[PDB]
Amino acid sequence: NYQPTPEDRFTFGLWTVGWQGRDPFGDATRRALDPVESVRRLAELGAHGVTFHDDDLIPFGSSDSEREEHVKRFRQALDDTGMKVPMATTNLFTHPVFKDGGFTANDRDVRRYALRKTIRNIDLAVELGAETYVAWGGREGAESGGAKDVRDALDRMKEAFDLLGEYVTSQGYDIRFAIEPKPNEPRGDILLPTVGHALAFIERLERPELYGVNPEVGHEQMAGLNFPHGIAQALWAGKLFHIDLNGQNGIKYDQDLRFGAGDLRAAFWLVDLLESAGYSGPRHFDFKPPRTEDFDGVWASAAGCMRNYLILKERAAAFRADPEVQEALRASRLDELARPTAADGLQALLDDRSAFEEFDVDAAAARGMAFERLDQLAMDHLLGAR
Amino acid sequence: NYQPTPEDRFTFGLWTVGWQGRDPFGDATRRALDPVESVRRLAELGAHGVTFHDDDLIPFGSSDSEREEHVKRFRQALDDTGMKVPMATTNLFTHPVFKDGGFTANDRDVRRYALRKTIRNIDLAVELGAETYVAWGGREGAESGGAKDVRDALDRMKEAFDLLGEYVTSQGYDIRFAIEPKPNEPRGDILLPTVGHALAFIERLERPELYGVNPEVGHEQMAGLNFPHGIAQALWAGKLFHIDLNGQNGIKYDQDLRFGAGDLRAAFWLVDLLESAGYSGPRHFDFKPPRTEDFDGVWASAAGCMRNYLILKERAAAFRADPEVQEALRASRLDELARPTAADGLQALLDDRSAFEEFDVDAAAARGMAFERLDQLAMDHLLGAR
Amino acid sequence: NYQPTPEDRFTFGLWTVGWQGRDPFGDATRRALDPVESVRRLAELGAHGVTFHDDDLIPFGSSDSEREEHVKRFRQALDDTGMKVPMATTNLFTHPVFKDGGFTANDRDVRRYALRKTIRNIDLAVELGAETYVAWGGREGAESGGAKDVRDALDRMKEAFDLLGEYVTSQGYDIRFAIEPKPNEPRGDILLPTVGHALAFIERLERPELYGVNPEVGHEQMAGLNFPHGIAQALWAGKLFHIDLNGQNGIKYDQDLRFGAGDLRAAFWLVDLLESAGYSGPRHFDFKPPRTEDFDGVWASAAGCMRNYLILKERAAAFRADPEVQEALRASRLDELARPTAADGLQALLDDRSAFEEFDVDAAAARGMAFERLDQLAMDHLLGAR
Amino acid sequence: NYQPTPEDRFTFGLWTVGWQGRDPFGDATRRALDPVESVRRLAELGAHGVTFHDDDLIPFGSSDSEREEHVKRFRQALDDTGMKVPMATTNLFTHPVFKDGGFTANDRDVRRYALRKTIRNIDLAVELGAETYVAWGGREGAESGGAKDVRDALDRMKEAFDLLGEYVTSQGYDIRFAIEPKPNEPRGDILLPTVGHALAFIERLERPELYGVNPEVGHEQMAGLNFPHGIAQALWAGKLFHIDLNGQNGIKYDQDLRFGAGDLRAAFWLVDLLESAGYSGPRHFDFKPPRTEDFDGVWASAAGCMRNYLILKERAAAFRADPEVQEALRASRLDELARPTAADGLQALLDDRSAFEEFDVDAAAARGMAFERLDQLAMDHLLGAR
Ligand SMILES: OC[C@H]1O[C@@H](O)[C@H](O)[C@@H](O)[C@@H]1O
Ligand SMILES: OC[C@H]1O[C@@H](O)[C@H](O)[C@@H](O)[C@@H]1O
Ligand SMILES: OC[C@H]1O[C@@H](O)[C@H](O)[C@@H](O)[C@@H]1O
Ligand SMILES: OC[C@H]1O[C@@H](O)[C@H](O)[C@@H](O)[C@@H]1O
Ligand SMILES: [Mg+2]
Ligand SMILES: [Mg+2]
Ligand SMILES: [Mg+2]
Ligand SMILES: [Mg+2]
Ligand SMILES: [Mn+2]
Ligand SMILES: [Mn+2]
Ligand SMILES: [Mn+2]
Ligand SMILES: [Mn+2]
Structure with a gap:
């Protein structure tokens, strides 16, 4: 039951099932994982592909040989399994040189170096066939107000991304960029803290169509925001290039629980949105098997991600196909929300006396929206109590 | 000491000092205020102008006479005082007809009516000379996931604002629009929840240059975000048309404390940013004298808003002019953050061996940012302990 | 399916289904409800009883006649239905006299009056047969630091509750008190903000066994806390006298969604705890039908509360009875957590070389907790995917 | 100006200025510190003492020699400086063996080992002369609902602390225990999440007077709570044995900013409370020099902690001594809040017709609290603008 297949487009970072369990207050609870074994275990689980930071695959400071x-070892694991590599990213946060950021570090020479680090790995990711390159500016921010002139840092951020888009254009690459927002941690406040802030920044870039967003369930929930709403604006903007699925209990540190844990109802509305919008990119999991778990628990955790997606997919589809729900949707006038407001034109609106002079405001106000019956119907479908 | 003058551009909504003190769990603690007395008391305090919702000035359902x-009574109060009216807005949230929203209500006929209500008041606001019309979509949202298809609601929101911009274009008006973001309350989640989400939405509008943002200190703080950072992206985008100043203790209900209360340090970094960026619009206060206060406390509260702005203005200016702070700013390489990263070009960067092959990563990582001395200098200036 | 019966001990406040829909920014969307019709509609739904504030039942300032x-009209509705009245409370928050609090108002004469208001209604509630009197100090707090010396206000709070316990002792009443915590709203910060703070305060009271807590799902979630954990400490302390069930989306204003909405997984762990601990008090719903709803939606909302409780009751019972879950529970050593740590005594512990000198720390650290398989089993039971 | 002296009772953990800068996403930015150099640098700064975890002073797994x-090296540094050691604590969180907790780990043998680890270090701390032993149960909690029966874990927690109090009683020690609350991180939810929860738990202990709380500014602010209010209830309960001073920007990860950063106004109300209550324990700083800083910035950071305390001490004292503030305090009836509510007795209250039958509710409701003038006076004192 609810079994994943590579067609389901499930992918994982090497850093997820690979997380050794070092937290702010704790040492590692698990040995490191050869990227090769992760590719094989994930393939066995029904995964479609893997993603990587540059330093997850080639240890930092490795010689050319x-x-x-x-890479040779990694390529052979994908060949053996059929695994894909749909996305890659640069680690511009672990090494101490990035302590004040990468593309927006105050030191100019750190920014130039962060660009060379990213450009090197774009080459590699294109070779492995990634279609999306992700940027997570987790060190772009500040802990105190005077350490970063934000308008200046946005100038620097725009130059970094403009230059990156100039590079892939100059190479003929098909790869596109996806910014991953996060409101805070590790910096006290991170720049482009939300999906919205990232969409707005892309529109000031030189070639905007080259860039989209890679929202993560937990990062918007770290700011108390509605993740499906944010996804809806990303899809409305045509900029959902990639997505990161996981779980988060409200406003606290970045938990990265397996997908479906944390806010279960929001996961349901998310899957319903991705499916009904026909999202076709990878369903990527960016989670951390809690450091209480041994290797066996790591793989049960990753298996739980895909299962919970498949369960929610079925419930949400049953929801949208139920004729009682379709009748309730009409009752709540969701059909009327899809109709244009004034297809007749400004002038027609200005003269339509039934829109002001003769609008029965009290009659309209007295019409219930019937939202509770609709929502209880959604809950019954989620829980399988219809 | 720290005394405001109309040149300081301080303005207030009628709804602020006019708030009768009805909260979710409480009845009014103060009688209603004639808008005329508010104009006079505020003028006496050194205010520059007032703003209004349509229904703050003309009671809902008033006859033409x-x-x-x-209006005649109101115009005479501004003439008597020299008060201005720099901004107005529509009340699309109080009347029960707007319970599911205004421009994005599911019922089409409510949306058309909300447009006629706004268009009527734009006329009025232009007559009183407002330069900015504000939209706060406080009822645009939902409490449950199925009651609002967000992509549909954004379609409707884009039509409403496109139509409004078509109207002021057709009339030759100079007025511009400013969207006011809010993440939640009264709706469980509000659409365009942050400054970022509002900037991104404006870029999909038909005539984007006609629209900007009206951020409110407390609304970004309701989502745990850094208000000065958000302002910095608005100014970077050129879309700070208006601003709402108040105070907020973190993530909870919308408090609307007088400006300077709540997060005092963030208020300092905000004033420093507005001043150094040369923000020239109104310094508008959108606050609520706590319902514990009588009329005398209402005016002491409004007086505290302007005073706290003036105090912070002086401390922040003393901060940026102190040569020790200018030396610290160089120490933390804030000057280097303002320099372009690769004015020499992509190709020069790709060949600059000092940016990768010969970058001493460990030397650069060992250079402290000296952010703590800088911040302690800022604190000493804030507190007057230099 | 999942149908409630009065034996299920479901109760409602008059103020819940009675809420006219006035919010901070909105007017009423529904007419007022005669308490009699609410008793009848709720009875029809399978409810067990109703609760009331004094002013929900007798309009404030009513004459003796x-x-x-x-009361005569109310008593006849309970007789006609079999409805009970298991709990009552005083409204010490709506009238403007309570703007600085009730039992801790700065004005002494307000505090004395709040005590007389409560004592009058205790008499009434005993007549209607309530077994619990609830105190919600929603106005006990402050918006600024100097307006309330907290240690003084706790002195006053202790006197109010000591006096109340002296009264019911002097009358021979069986009724007990339950403090209802809330961290904020309407005050900027409320005293006794959490279940913990309320338990600690009770232990300084004159006759502590007379007082317990009435936690509300949403109020602990307003401070980012785990509601089942808080309930567990209340039950560990023997002070779960009453409980308020509803739903809440994280840290924001007090939403009072119907039970089961908001954090669905936490609702599941709550019901599992209440049932397995054998909680026997009322299952009281303190919710607000969203003001989008007409009267029909009000009753669908209240019906959804009991249904969602019954669904979760079944899933959680199926969870604890599943032998795979019982095997997993042993795997995660939940049985070992129930065993005493050192039944052998301090001295035996001090000499047990297998507890320090010869403890294989690395072997123990390498044993996975198997928490993910356990949790995925819980999720499968919740969703009915076993 | 504002210079600390050992009489000011300022202390620091070795782990604070000793923090190498490893965060969840980053490697160390600073070399390790010999505890001896920290004692000397801190002494030079005007500190009074240092605190330590067992493993900060003796590296884990050290031989007896x-x-x-x-210890010999450490004792000589305190002798050379006059530094004291007023508090110590056990590290029951770093080693992987504690991944499911210490005193409440599911594995019994881990709990026994955690007790032996604590008891060993109590001996040591008494030798160095500490007067308070701190317990921070940062691993006592869970990420999912089924992994920890909370009532069971509280049983185990009560046994651990009962046993510890049995030990120091059996040895004649004078040392007392202080529980340090934290709501979350590293566990998804931590047991005894707040000051309140810790006070309540102490009252169920065998010898409660042996235990108090060690609240930390940032930990209560991680749950949106008012830190001075929490301190006020701790002092009201007589259980402020120790305190941890630092800074925190609202609800997010545990930041541990230097004291005075983060919420500046709450720091002011805290210092005013500690001083006016005559708190006499150590003023302990539990902060982290941001990993952007080199060794020089570490010491500027620690210097900023004490300075900001001294500045706030002066402003708050000037506040309470200003006759305008004393007149305002009477205006807001803070004097009346300190008076008993019914010194005349229940019966006198029940017969006092001026408390109900003849209470002019409307007159009392119309009296403003004058809280805004009071608060603006407090702000003027904070900023030095009187
Ligand atoms: O760089 C991209 C990725 O970096 C990872 O280390 C973080 O955990 C993710 O938030 C992010 O998706
Ligand atoms: O409509 C604009 C205004 O409406 C007011 O009622 C709200 O309090 C403000 O948030 C907003 O600025
Ligand atoms: O007084 C007790 C009750 O008062 C109600 O008005 C509030 O909504 C509840 O939080 C509380 O249970
Ligand atoms: O064990 C006591 C201490 O442990 C430290 O590592 C934590 O950072 C503090 O929160 C706590 O005061
Ligand atoms: Mg991610
Ligand atoms: Mg506003
Ligand atoms: Mg309640
Ligand atoms: Mg601490
Ligand atoms: Mn994350
Ligand atoms: Mn507001
Ligand atoms: Mn509530
Ligand atoms: Mn901390």
Whole structure:
């Protein structure tokens, strides 16, 4: 039951099932994982592909010879399994050089170096066939107000992304960029903190169509926001290039629980939205098996991500196909929300006496929206109590 | 000391000092205020102008005759004082007809009516000389996931604003629009919840240059975000048309404390940003004298808003002019953040061996940012302990 | 399916289904409800009883004659239905006199009056047979630091509750008190903000066994806390006298969604705890039909509360009875958590070399907790996907 | 100006200025510190003492010989400086064995080992002369609902603390215990999440007077709570044995900013409370120099903690001594809040017709509290603008 297949487009970062369990207050609870074993275990689970930071695949500071061998070993695991690599990203946050950021570090020479680090790995990711390159500016921010002139840092951020788009244009690459928002942690406040802030920033870029967003369930929930609403604006803007699925209990540190844990109802509305909008990119999981777990629990965790997606997919589809729900949807006038407000034109609106002079405001106000019956119907479908 | 003058551009809504003190769990603690007395008391305090919702000035459902008289009385108060009216807005939230929203209500006929209500008041606001019309979509949202298809609601929101911009274009008006974001309350989640989400939405509008944002200190703080950072992206985008100043203690209900209360340090960084960016619009206060206060406390509260702005203005200016702070700013390389990252070009960057092959990563990582000394200098200036 | 019966002990406040829909920014969307019709509609729904504030039942300032008639009418509705009245409370928050609090108002004469208001209604509630009197100090708090010396206000709070316990002792009443915590709203910060703070305060009271807590799902979630954990400490302390069930989306204004909405998984762990601990008090719903709803939606909302409780009751019972879950519970050593740590005594512990000198720390650290398989089993039961 | 002296009772953990800068997403930015150099640098800064976890002072797994030498070296640094050691604590969170907790780990043998680890270090701390032993149960909690029966875990927590109090009683020690609350991180939810929850738990202990709380500014602010209010209830309960001073920007990860950063106004109300209550324990700083800083910035950070305390001490004292503020305090009836509510007795209250039958509710409701003038006076004192 609810079994994933590579057609379901499930992918994982190497850093997810690979997380050794070091937290702010704790040491590692698990040994490191060869990227090769992760590709195989995930393939066995029904995964479609894997993603990586540059330093997850080639250990930082590796020699050219070792780099070649680390890729050779990795390529052979994908060949053996059929695994894909749909996305890659640069680690511009772990090494101490990035302590004040990467593309927006105050030191100019750190910013130039962060660009060379990203450009090197774009080459690699294109070779492995990734279609999306992700940027997570987790060190772009500040803990105190005077350490970062934000308008200046946005200037620098725009130059970094403009230059990156100039590079892939100059190489003929098909890869596109996806910014991953996060409101805080590790910096006290991170720049482009939400899906909205990232969409707005893309529109000031030189070639905007080259960039989209990679929202993560938990990051919007770290700011108390509605994740499906944010996804809806990303899809409305045509900029859902990639997505990160996980779970989060409200406003606290970045938990990265397996998908479906945390806010279960919001996961349901998310899957219903992705499916009904026909989202076709990877269903990528960016989670951390809690450091209480041994290797066996790591894989049960990753298996739980895909299962919970498949369960929610079925419930949400049953929801939208139920004729009682379709009748309730008409009752709540969801059909009327899809109709244009004034297809007749401004002038027609200005003269339509039934829109002001003769609008029975009290009659309209007395019409219930019937939202509770609709929502209780959604809950019954979620829980299988119809 | 720290005394405001109309040149300081301080303005107030009628609804602020006019708030009778009805909260979710409480009845009014103060009688209603004639808009005329508010104009006079505020003028006495050194205010520059007032703003209004349509229904703050003309009681809802007033006859044409009464409407004329309510304006006549108001115009005479501004003449008597020199008060201005720099901004107005529509009340699309109080009357029960707007319970599911205004421009995005599911019922089409409510949306058409909300447009006629706004268009009527734009006329009025232009007559009183407002330069900015504000939209706060406080009822645009939902409490449950199925009651609002967000992509549909954004379609409707785009039509409403496109139509409004078509109207002021057709009339030759100079007025511009400013969207006021809010993440939640009264709806469970509000659409365009943050400054970012509002900037992104404006870029999909038909004539974007006609629209900007009207951020409110407390609304971004309701989502745990850094208000000065948000303002910085608005100014970077050129869309700070208007601003709402108040105070807020973190993530909870919308408090609307007088400006300077709540997060005092963020108020300092905000004033420093507005001043150094040369923000020239009104310094508008959108606050609520706590319902514990009588009329005398209402005016002490409004007086505290302007005073706290003036105090912070002085401290922040002393901060940026102190040569020790200018030396610290160089120490933390804030000057280097303002320099372009690769004015030399992509190709020069790709060949600059000092940016990768010969970058001493460990030397750069070992250079402290000196952010703490800088911040302690800012604190000393704030508190007057230099 | 999942149909409630009065044996299920479901109760409602008059103020819940009675809420006219006035919010901070909106007018009423529904007419007022005669308490009699609410008793009948709720009875029809399978409810067990109703609760009331004094002013929900007798309008504030009623004459003795009218008071008698309002009770006569109410008593006859309970007789006609079999409805009970298991709990009552005082409204010490709506009238403007309570703007600085009730039992802790700065004005002494307001505090004395709040005590007389409560004592009058205790008499009434005992007559209607309530077994619990609830105190919600929603106005006990402050918006600014200097307006309330907290240690003084706790002195006053202790005197109010000591006096109340002296009264019911002097009358021979069986009724007990339950404090209802809330962290904020309407005050900027409320005293005794959490279940913990309320438990601690009770232990300083003169006759502590007379007082317990009445936690509300949403109020602990307004402070980002785990509601089942809080309930567990209340039950561990023996002070779960009453409970308020509803739903809440994280840290924001007090939403009072119907039970089961908001955090669905936490509702599941709550019902599992209440049932397995054998909680026997009323299952009281303190919710607000969203003001989008007409009268029909009000009753669908209240019906959804009981249904969602019954659904969760079944899933959680199926969870604890599943032998796979019982095997997983042993795997995660939940049985070992119930065993005493050192039944052998301090001295035996101090000499047990297998507890320090010869403890294989690395072997123990390498044992996974298997928490993910356990949790995925709980999720499968919740969703009916076993 | 504002210079600390050992009489000011300022102390620091070794782990604070000793923090190498490893965060969830980053490697160390600073070398490790010999505890000896920290004692000397802090002494030079005007600190009074240092605190330590067992593993900050003796590296985990040290041989008896090395242990002796690490203490010998440490004792000589305190002798050379006059530094004291007023508090110590056990590290029951870093080693992987504690991944499911210490005193409440599901594995019994981990709990026994955690007790032996604590008891060993109590001996040591008494030798160095600490007067308070702190317990921070940062691993006592859970990420999912089924992994920890909370009532069971409280049973285990009560046994651990009862046993610890049995030990210090059996040894004649004077040391007392202080529980340090935290709502979350590293566990998804931590047991005893707030000051309140910790006070309530102490009252169920065998010898409660042996235990108090060690609240930390940032931990209560992680749950949106008012830190001075929490301190006020701790002092009202007589259980402020110790305190941790730092700074925190609202509800997010545990930031541990230097004291005075984050919520500046709440720091002011805190210092005013500690001083006016005559708190006499150590003023302990539990902060992290941001990993952007080199060694020089570490010490500027620690210096900023004490300075900001001294500045706030002066402003708050000037506040309480200003006769205008004393007149305002009477205006807001803070004097009346300190008076008993019914010193005359229940019966006198029941017969006092001026408390109900003849209470002019409308007159009392119309009296403003004058809280805004009072608060603006407090702000003027904070900023030095009187
Ligand atoms: O760089 C991209 C990724 O970096 C990871 O280390 C973070 O955990 C993710 O939030 C992000 O998706
Ligand atoms: O409509 C604009 C205004 O409406 C007011 O009632 C709200 O309090 C403000 O948030 C908003 O600025
Ligand atoms: O007084 C007790 C009750 O008062 C109601 O008005 C509030 O909504 C509840 O939080 C509380 O249970
Ligand atoms: O164990 C006591 C201490 O442990 C430290 O590592 C934490 O950072 C503090 O929150 C706590 O005061
Ligand atoms: Mg991610
Ligand atoms: Mg506003
Ligand atoms: Mg309640
Ligand atoms: Mg601490
Ligand atoms: Mn994350
Ligand atoms: Mn507001
Ligand atoms: Mn509530
Ligand atoms: Mn901390």
